[PDB]
Each structure stands twice: as C-alpha cells, then as structure tokens.
Homo-oligomer: A and B are copies of this chain.
C-alpha cells in the first residue's frame, strides 16, 4: 500500500495552495480537478460519452466541453448533474489510480474537493487532511479569483459539505484563514514529517 492522503476542503479554502507546499517537499500530487479538466478538454477521455449523453449542443467547436452551457444546465437540472457526474467520476477515479500507480514520491496526496461527501474516497485514503476556513473567506476568495458573484459561490458552497461535517471527518486540519499563506509552511513541514513516519510504518 502506497501511503495515501486525501486532501480536501471547500471551494476557495486553499487546497491548491497547501497541495503545492506538500509537492515542494516531495509528496506526489494527484489533483482530481486537473484530471476532471483534462478528461473534458479537446480529445478528452470523457467527451464521447458526453456528446452521446447530452448531444453536440454541449460540445464546443474545438471538441472540448462547452463548460458554460453545461455550467448552467447542471445547476438548473440536478437530474443532469447526476448524469454528468456519472460519466466523469468513474473516469476521474480511474485516472487517479493510474497516476498513483506511477507516482515516485514517498506518499501520495489525492486532492479531492468532494472527499467526505463520498463514501468511496474516505475508504481509499489512509488519512484525511482538511484545509479549513470560514465560509465568507471562501466567498471573497472565489469572487476575486474566478469573477463569480456571491450567489454563484454560495450555490457551490451549498452543494458541498458543511465546515462542521468536514472537520468531523478529518484526521488532520489546516486552518487557512491568515491574511497570508507564509505561515502555512510551518504546518506543512510538521505534517510532511508525520506523513513520512506513517508511510514508513505501512
């Protein structure tokens, strides 16, 4: 068993920021969001199924997913959300095992936005690391980064687990609410070490 850490956290909480720090220290990163984008890019592994299931309406002229039109439809119709996720999730799952098999570091970190929401991911990981922060900080950061409105972010936040549920399912926690990310490194240093020890013991 390659030692596996699930890194999760709500939208805008800091998963990417924390993940990078662990990568700089030699952890092997498998970002399920990068995979989700590539499998729906031009020539992506998920596109045949998506065209078939949704129609050429949702395939843009470059072959990729029309992320806009879809962005709307799965918000509008949560029968459609489940229909898309039923295509993408198994593929993401699969690409994850495949990247994990090839990973060269002493342990792996799977960056998984909807980790605790899913039964399968908790079982797949040796530990869960939650990057936590207040909901209003999530909102401000995601408005700033992606240009959305409150309502748009609030809508994603509502489709995700509460802070309390996330914190309850954690083995490890990094509260990322400082004005600045410079102090995160101290926390990541210590977790890295503990992770090396965990892995070595298994």
> A100 near B: Cβ within 8 Å?
yes
> A25 near B: Cβ within 8 Å?
no
Q: CA of A100 to CA of B46 in the docked complex: distance in angstroms?
A: 11
Chain B residues whose C-beta falls within 8 Å of the C-beta of A51 in the assembled complex: 1
Number of copies: 2
Known: A91-B94, A93-B90. Is A123-B52 also a contact (CB below 8 A)? Answer: yes
Contact between chains at A45 and B101 (CB < 8 Å): yes
Known: A90-B90, A90-B94, A94-B91. Is A123-B83 also a contact (CB below 8 A)? Answer: yes
Q: CA of A93 to CA of B91 in the docked complex: distance in angstroms?
A: 7
Within 8 A of B (CB), among A110-125: 119-120, 123-125
> A81 near B: Cβ within 8 Å?
no
Chain B residues whose C-beta falls within 8 Å of the C-beta of A98 in the assembled complex: 45
Residues of A within 8 A of B (CB): 1-2, 4, 45-46, 48-49, 51-53, 83, 86-87, 89-91, 93-95, 97-98, 100-101, 119-120, 123-126
